[PDB]
Design a protein around this ligand. Structure first.
Ligand code: HEM
Ligand code: HEM
Ligand SMILES: CC1=C(/C=C/C(C)=C\C=C\C(C)=C\C=C\C=C(C)\C=C\C=C(C)\C=C\C2=C(C)CCCC2(C)C)C(C)(C)CCC1
Lengths: 160, 29, 215, 32, 37, 168, 31, 288, 215, 160, 37, 288, 29, 31, 168, 32
């Protein structure tokens, strides 16, 4: 049952779009009420409720007042910056690490161009891609954890 | 000293229940 | 009454709007992970409210920044809540965003007609990180201060301009009041506008081209 | 952990309860 | 500092998500088409 | 077999009722947030710079007819008249003109305070003489204690008009 | 470092519990 | 010793960098942990465990030269208004886990900064602190929130005395460069063994180098390894640690209303999904 | 090349956009006074740039506000210019707006299908005046301070709420640091967003219904 | 010549709009280039140039530092607030003047409703309106100047 | 204060504008229609 | 007199309210203007005209009682670093318009705050100040900008002496209430006429009321108008004024580049309109 | 001391010239 | 108060000068 | 009769060229605006609180091996070593680690400064010992004059490496 | 006033000059 509408594949205007890579909001279950009115407020409420709960149970700390003459040993960026921070301290060349930093956005920009050689979505039907991704994702989590560690058990992660 | 614990459980229960209600709500995945 | 709907319908063709929303369908390859985007947004709207809330007590001055944050936690009614929510929802925005990227990729939604949507996204990400970095240092606590000192220095590696860049970044040769002033402008005025422009593009292009196809 | 796990099972079970319950209360007074 | 709860929250959701993603990709790669592309 | 209109409205009310529930729940602490913390939570006069007007060479370097402002209560600026056989008048005249809140200057010519903003006026104790200022200036109790000055809420009645102190 | 373990453990696992629970609702209702 | 930190650095055991003055004299480095609960209600006794691990069945160099076991010390820094629980209020098992520790405050009034030790290694691998949470409702410059706790924990005797002189649980260099001349082995009626050594030719060269007993020597006869070096080996099997942690002084009212709100939410979600189902129904009559 | 226009045309149907602009004509009853609107806008965009410029030096703190304005005039390169432009363009916005209203009226452009456009306009006017009033008092000079003291007191006339309103307005019973903090949030964060929302409506409705008719 | 396109009054879709009060951007000279590209930058540049010029020739003053104990005699709002300010000090009732203040926006809101009785644009073909307007505009300029004046030559404007 | 230059600038433009407005209303009220409404 | 302001109020002639201490003693009120140019280049001599108008062919009450003309005084407050031009640099006609005025500074160093007068009414209806503009290029805490100038100008003798005693150019009340008894007309060998008056019955009543000569009396014999009142009429035909104005210390570089930019603009506008015309042409070939 | 005057004239001349160029530009009013 | 008069005077009058001047251009060009 | 393409492009260039003209004209002062005012526009050491380290009981209450930070030039934090026969070393070692700018602590154990941020290290005079810090710490000239301390730009050459001072 | 009026007339006349001039230079090399 659900609630459904099949694609009218006899519609020139629809087919013309399916052709271009984008007829896909013409068929399915109706966006309204079904999702917008009824299951949205579910998602938005849940998102909010988990944040409030987290905010009550593990509230925000207030740190020491800044001191120009005293760098805190054990100073770390936020978590989403660990990976890059890790890199920056395991690349003795200052200027190099900075470009390695920049190449994360620049690189990500170039992905749609490269991977446009073919036109598959499903990652199983695109081996090479899915692999370099999994490799990156892994290396990134690795470098991230690496920052949690003392300077020189950092890369080896302390087990070799 | 374990309303402190009922406390965290509330969190785990909206996380769970929100996922559950989305899946149910959209015959979902 | 005096039919209200009709009133608006004569003038603005209000119906067109509705007919445009209710004419859209969501295909069956669209699963729960197609939410990660709307959630990253939800997290932002929370930033926007709690953020603005805090602009009513926060003082972007080296003499008063830290003390005012303390005021919010201790003395302002529900201040502890508004600020904790800001802090958590910041992290959940960055996270839900990363997840949102994961899907897109493993769904090939950045391909063919939609590479601009992907490009804009990458910009949104760079902006969102800048929100983070700037906010981090507003309490002018120990960790936040030394953060500013570090990142402000990074552009000096770059050879021709770099220094010129860093001085704009921090308002002088060194971190100081100028730096807090500019980071505040950045966090509360510049980045919200930038992020709205680019969210607007992102969303406009999505509405135009609809969701990517099945796998 | 043990106490949390108890309270947890009860909490959901309790709401899972309300849900199922109010489907049928809602189904067999034919609102659904 | 390092915010343990948040850091575990990340990983937990990262892995759980990549997982469900590949799993939905599979569930589809083996029951394909439906409806005509 | 298919739910009739009025049964939808019941399930509308229910869902959209409980949602409003959440919305108000969330709104409440936020509204409280914007409403400032009350300093009233849970006396000694002061100078412009913020110093505790010591009465010794205040009695001296100001004369008679002289009337100089002083941080009153709520820190409000409060005139203190020097009497023509100079000790202090019992009571201080709170300077905030009662219309829209400008500090009112003592015009020693026409002996009469006059709001520079829109035009209100007052007599030599406070009592309103013109408008758009509704009521007259507030007052207080000024003693000589510990050789500062101690201002107290004028809790008793308006000695210039009879009955109720409009302010306290 | 146990405050973390609980968190990874649970964020991951409770996903499957909510999923299961939802699917379960679906069965008792009839999709 | 903990009380030497007090002696030498009176107003506080930690500097603006977060270091802790202890590490000025205990130069080795071994790990230090500090577990406390994630949250404590106000006016509550709870446990704070300071861990100072080290290999129990090994020993170290004593003052004279012997080979003695070793003791553990520690400064814990709790947040404002926290203090050791009044003993009437410490429950039973706790009293026992705690033992015979003297929770000496770092200075008059600072009951939230506790020195501790020297205690004997083998009973105090771990050290329980029974502490009491302040109460924002009564003391009115104490607030609910998350606050930091700082540990510095040591084990094994140190390398420098409050006077400035070196100890004997470190290694000695060699002053200058040259060929080693003599390895004596003094022991005057008091202040025992005193291996005396010296170097030469090069240029001038005769400077004398005493080396207290307890260390090894692994530089032998002949030799000439250069400007201040090697001659002693490292006797030190001790070392200092540090940790930091978070604790939330929680208000049960906050938790109660949060739980209430959550429930209102889960309820409102359910109510919406039910509504959707009821719509999927009136819809299936519009297909046919 | 590799035709760039085509690139975008495949994906976003860029042409539609152009065809929508070039398909619009401007009738002959439309004279110079039909500019007063676009000029009031031009004046605002200038506010937006020079305003933001000044957020890089202005300090919303009673200790430093006045001094920082002095800094902008005296020490910041072209600061005298940026701020004088802000001050003049503020007044020219309010003025050109009044003129814009004059025409509309004496052109009956607020009639029949366009009464919402007029309504929104009235709101834009109230917002624009609030920009003025708030900015006025940011230098924390003598005139600006007493301005705040007066207007903050006006709502107290209103009987049930009034006081409650005024306390929100000024952050306490009395003008003070809280007041400057809130007026700053108002001027640099709230009113720009509000004024963009309502300018967006105004303009959307105008594009929909086109210009009013001939006389 | 100019450049022109007459209304295609045979176009059902156009006529349908002219009917509703809004077909008017369908006929005339083309909006682009003609105005947008060519005469706009003229208007925008001129607007800007007059402001810069004014800003150089008559730059911004900096006033005295605020003093809690000292209200400046001769204190005035900006010019666009004179009229209302005038009112506020020639209406001995505090609360009344405030409502008179508020009725300026509220009143202006109500204009399209009232004047909708008929549907003329040209003000010559609407006497009553054009009159109450001219009267208001005049009274407003009057009250405005009035604030420039000393309290009690204010209304009389000093000539009666 | 009172900013004389600005205040004269206002009036100047106010009157000049109301003027040109009524004058364009007239110029139209006497040469009407053109093109068919 | 101007110099009495100095005497009584040393650090400044104006209070935080912008008033000017003069008005404490000259209680009447007549207008005061101050014209200066809209802009002055730096290091330039320019004119600043202080106007103190009053009806020339009328007179006022002198000290004793006579009926003398009257003098004009004034404090002008120029902005920082402004001062009276060095006489070598004042041109010719200017020297003449200025006259024999003594531009006395309000205090040592404050050359931009000038006291002036008493001068005789009829030559000094208007008072020229030849002043010199500072130079931001040399003095380095002087900046280009717009700055305020403040005038307080008086004419006719005042109502209160530096001692506190009243003068005779005001009106006198009556102390208490009662029926008037006597109108004498003293004039001791010094300190001349001294109309002496008194009141009575009511209750106690006999208080004596002297009234210096110069005023009128317009309360006659009999009478009993009440608590301090009327009896004198107003002799004062004098009074104090105030003005404030703006002046722009302009930098010619600013003006030059602004004129350059304008021209670039007018040019770019013309260039656009020309382009439009050229398009209206290629267009008229698309109609036909 | 009358570049000060050429100064104001520049203003009056763009005001005038801008109006003039609009009217010309749009065969205008 | 003359700084004003000039300003009202001129803002008003120069409008007509620019108008005239523009119209004039139109004539020398031929509309 | 009707202008040919290439004559439009000429009138394009002209108008759109002069417009750019205006745009850059306007942009210029704005860019200059955001570029901070230089304090370099047109010596004595200081304490944390901001006091002028008087050398009298500085020589006393600090010992030998001791090395305490001090507001150097550009107000930068600058260590000043107390010598083992305590007068002052000639030169101060500017504390800002040369990688990304953290203040570097003196580890008196391994006698060697170590950046807590990413891991750089330095010897007992400054010379770089590890990275990611490129060059070594800066220096200066420290005298005893007027019984403060006077720091001067180390204009001469790098006595620890030979040739050019990378900083001045 | 007099000086301003002179400079003013010259200034426009000068630009009015450039305008007219460059119409015809532009018209009679047939760019327009
Ligand atoms: C179960 C939850 C959700 C699902 C399955 C989902 C899925 C989608 C899909 C399929 C689209 C493409 C629409 C199209 O093809 O026309 C979309 C777009 C969008 N979604 Fe959602 N989403 C969810 C939650 C949310 C939430 C909670 C928000 C909160 C604001 C949100 C905001 C948006 C926005 C702003 C767009 C822009 C594209 C457009 O307007 O068409 N989404 N989402
Ligand atoms: C000679 C100068 C101008 C004239 C004659 C004029 C006239 C007009 C007209 C007739 C409309 C209605 C458009 C329609 O019916 O579709 C309009 C709308 C609009 N104008 Fe202009 N205007 C001028 C200058 C400007 C300037 C300088 C701006 C600067 C941004 C501007 C911005 C706008 C905006 C934002 C709209 C919104 C309505 C829409 O998008 O259609 N105008 N103007
Ligand atoms: C900045 C600027 C601007 C603005 C402006 C304004 C602000 C205003 C203007 C306005 C104007 C533009 C005005 C006009 C007016 C006119 C008038 C006022 C008219 C009058 C005339 C008459 C009265 C007539 C006479 C006659 C004739 C002619 C014929 C018929 C008959 C008779 C006899 C009736 C513009 C836009 C320019 C442009 C750019 C720049």
């Amino acid at each position: 049952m659900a609630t459904l509408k099949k694609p009218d594949l006899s519609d020139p205007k629809l087919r013309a779009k399916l052709a271009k890579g984008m007829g896909h909001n013409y068929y399915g279950e109706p966006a309204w009420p079904n999702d917008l009115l009824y299951v949205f407020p579910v998602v938005i409420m849940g998102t909010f409720a988990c944040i409030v709960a987290l905010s009550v149970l593990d509230p925000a700390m207030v740190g020491e007042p800044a001191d120009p003459f005293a760098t805190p040993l054990e100073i770390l960026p936020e978590w989403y910056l660990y990976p890059v921070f890790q890199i920056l301290r395991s690349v003795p060349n200052k200027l190099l690490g900075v470009l390695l930093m920049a190449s994360v956005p620049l690189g990500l920009i170039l992905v749609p161009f490269i991977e446009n050689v073919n036109k598959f979505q499903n990652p199983f039907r695109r081996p090479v891609a899915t692999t370099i991704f999994l490799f990156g994702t892994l290396v990134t989590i690795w470098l991230g954890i690496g920052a949690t560690f003392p300077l020189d058990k950092t890369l080896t992660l302390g087990l070799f | 000293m374990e309303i402190d614990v009922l406390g965290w459980v509330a969190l785990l229960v909206v996380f769970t229940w929100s996922i559950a209600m989305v899946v149910w709500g959209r015959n979902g995945l | 009454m005096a039919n209200v709907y009709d009133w608006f319908q004569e003038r603005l063709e209000i119906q067109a709007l509705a007919d445009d929303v209710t004419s859209k369908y969501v295909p069956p390859h669209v699963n729960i992970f197609y939410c990660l985007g709307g959630i990253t947004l939800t997290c932002f709207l929370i930033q926007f409210a709690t953020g603005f809330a805090m602009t009513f007590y926060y003082k972007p001055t080296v003499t008063e920044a830290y003390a005012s944050v303390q005021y919010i936690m201790n003395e302002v009614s529900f201040g502890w809540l508004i600020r904790s929510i800001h802090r958590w929802s910041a992290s959940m925005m960055v996270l839900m965003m990363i997840l949102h990227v994961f899907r897109v990729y493993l769904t090939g939604g950045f391909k063919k007609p939609r590479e601009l949507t992907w490009i804009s996204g990458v910009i949104l990400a760079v902006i969102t990180v800048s929100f983070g970095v700037t906010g981090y240092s507003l309490p002018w606590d120990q960790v936040g201060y030394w953060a500013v000192k570090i990142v402000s220095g990074v552009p000096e590696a770059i050879p021709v301009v770099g220094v010129l860049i860093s001085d704009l970044l921090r308002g002088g040769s060194s971190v100081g009041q100028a730096t807090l002033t500019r980071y505040y402008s950045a966090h509360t005025f510049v980045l919200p506008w930038l992020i709205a422009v680019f969210m607007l593009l992102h969303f406009l292009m999505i509405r135009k081209q609809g969701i990517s196809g099945p796998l | 952990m043990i106490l949390g796990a108890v309270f947890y099972i009860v909490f959901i079970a309790l709401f899972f309860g309300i849900a199922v319950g109010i489907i049928f209360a809602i189904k067999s007074i034919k609102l659904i | 500092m390092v915010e343990p709860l948040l850091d575990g929250l990340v990983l937990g959701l990262v892995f759980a998500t990549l997982g469900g993603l590949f799993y939905a990709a599979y569930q589809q790669y083996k029951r394909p088409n439906e409806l005509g592309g | 077999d298919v739910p009739d209109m009025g049964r939808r409205q019941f399930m509308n009310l229910l869902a959209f009722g409980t949602v409003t529930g959440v919305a108000l729940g969330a709104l409440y602490p936020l509204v409280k947030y914007f409403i400032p913390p009350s300093g009233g939570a849970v006396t000694t006069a002061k100078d412009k710079l913020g110093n505790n007007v010591k009465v010794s060479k205040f009695l001296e370097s100001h004369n008679a007819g002289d009337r100089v402002l002083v941080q009153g209560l709520k820190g409000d600026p409060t005139y203190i008249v020097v009497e023509s056989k100079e000790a202090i008048r019992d009571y201080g005249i709170n300077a905030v003109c009662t219309h829209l809140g400008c500090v009112v200057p003592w015009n020693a010519a026409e002996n009469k305070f006059k709001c520079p903003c829109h035009g209100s006026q007052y007599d030599e104790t406070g009592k309103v003489i013109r408008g758009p200022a509704p009521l007259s200036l507030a007052l207080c109790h000024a003693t000589v204690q510990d050789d500062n000055i101690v201002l107290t809420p004028w809790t008793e009645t308006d000695f210039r008009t009879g009955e109720k102190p409009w302010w306290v | 470092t146990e405050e973390m373990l609980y968190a990874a453990l649970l964020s991951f696992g409770l996903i499957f519990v909510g999923w299961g629970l939802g699917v379960l609702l679906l069965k008792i209702q009839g999709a | 010793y903990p009380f030497w930190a007090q002696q030498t650095y009176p107003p506080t055991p930690r500097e603006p960098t977060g270091r802790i003055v202890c590490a000025n004299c205990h130069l080795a480095a071994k790990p230090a942990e500090v577990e406390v609960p994630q949250s404590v209600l106000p006016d509550t006794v709870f446990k704070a465990v300071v861990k100072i691990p080290y290999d129990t069945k090994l020993q170290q160099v004593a003052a004279d030269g012997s080979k003695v076991g070793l003791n553990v010390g520690a400064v814990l820094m709790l947040p404002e208004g926290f203090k050791i629980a009044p003993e009437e209020r410490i429950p039973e098992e706790l009293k026992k886990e705690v033992g015979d520790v003297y929770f000496q405050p770092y200075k008059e009034g600072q009951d939230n900064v506790l020195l501790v030790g020297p205690l004997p290694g083998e009973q105090y691998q771990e050290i329980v602190f029974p502490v009491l949470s302040p109460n924002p409702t009564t003391d009115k410059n104490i607030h609910f929130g998350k606050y930091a706790i700082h540990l510095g924990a040591n084990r094994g005797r140190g390398q420098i005395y409050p006077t400035g002189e070196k100890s004997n649980n470190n290694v000695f260099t060699a002053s200058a460069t040259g060929t080693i001349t003599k390895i004596a082995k003094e022991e005057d009626e008091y202040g025992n063994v005193k291996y005396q050594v010296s170097i030469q030719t090069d240029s001038g060269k005769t400077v004398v180098d005493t080396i207290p007993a307890g260390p090894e020597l692994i530089v032998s006869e002949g030799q000439a390894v250069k400007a201040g070096e090697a001659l002693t080996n490292n006797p030190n099997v001790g070392g200092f640690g540090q940790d930091d942690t978070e604790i939330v002084l929680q208000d049960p009212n906050r938790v109660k209303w949060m739980i209430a709100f959550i429930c209102l939410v889960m309820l409102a979600q359910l109510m919406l999904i039910l509504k959707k189902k009821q719509v999927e129904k009136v819809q299936a009559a519009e297909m046919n």
